[PDB]
């Protein structure tokens, strides 16, 4: 009994992506493509209290109203040092912003996914200099 | 929008990705899922199709030690020989000897990871990782 369902939500712009992906590479569902990524990335990590440095990267729609404001109360609601932000404008849509920061691991990563949630932020992605 | 699908997959394998849910922050298996389907498909992005196009863009993060002479000249003439652009960087001491900076770069993916690549292998570079963007993403 050995085969289970699980559902995914995806986003409609990642939805398309991993369609593309399946043709091009030719797999014959989305099923079978995730569950190989998931093999896959398996091979390839406990959180603790120790304060580490870590650079988030958000690219977000710079015409989103109040985006920026929502963006820092929640830097300074987190636990988090955060030694400074600077953004660049991309094209006429996007900006990508670097956060520096220091915390522990279970105040970054909350970090990471409350501006990753949201709307109008593309995607925010953590590197951890552990 | 947001568009629901099911993966179908062995108990086993499954509780190991289960396993990482509530670790990982998630309240849901789908975050860690997504963020690997997000992880992927940006790696097989850059890893097809154009040396002529130089509209990638990506976040170099490096911790080095500024104290050893020419490092940070061979880092810049690194750079400007990668025929990558760089954006912006900003700079942070984390300590006496060593500083933290995040170069924002644009270019295509070959002379991003190359200077990545190149950077990574210098004496007195301690880190050095790359966050790559596709335009999937933001587009």
Do not use: W
Request: charged share 25%; glycine share 4%; with cysteine.
């Amino acid at each position: 009994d050995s085969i289970i369902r699980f559902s995914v939500s995806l986003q409609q712009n990642l939805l398309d992506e991993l369609d593309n992906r399946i043709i091009k590479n030719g797999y014959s569902s989305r099923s079978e493509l995730v569950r190989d990524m998931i093999r896959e990335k398996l091979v390839e990590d406990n959180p603790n209290d120790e304060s580490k440095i870590a650079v988030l990267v958000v690219i977000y729609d710079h015409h989103q109203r109040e985006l920026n404001q929502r963006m820092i109360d929640i830097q300074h609601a987190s636990g988090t040092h955060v030694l400074c932000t600077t953004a660049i404008a991309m094209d006429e849509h996007n900006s990508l912003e670097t956060i520096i920061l220091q915390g522990n691991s279970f105040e970054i990563q909350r970090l990471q996914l409350e501006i990753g949630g949201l709307r109008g932020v593309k995607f925010a992605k953590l590197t951890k200099a552990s």
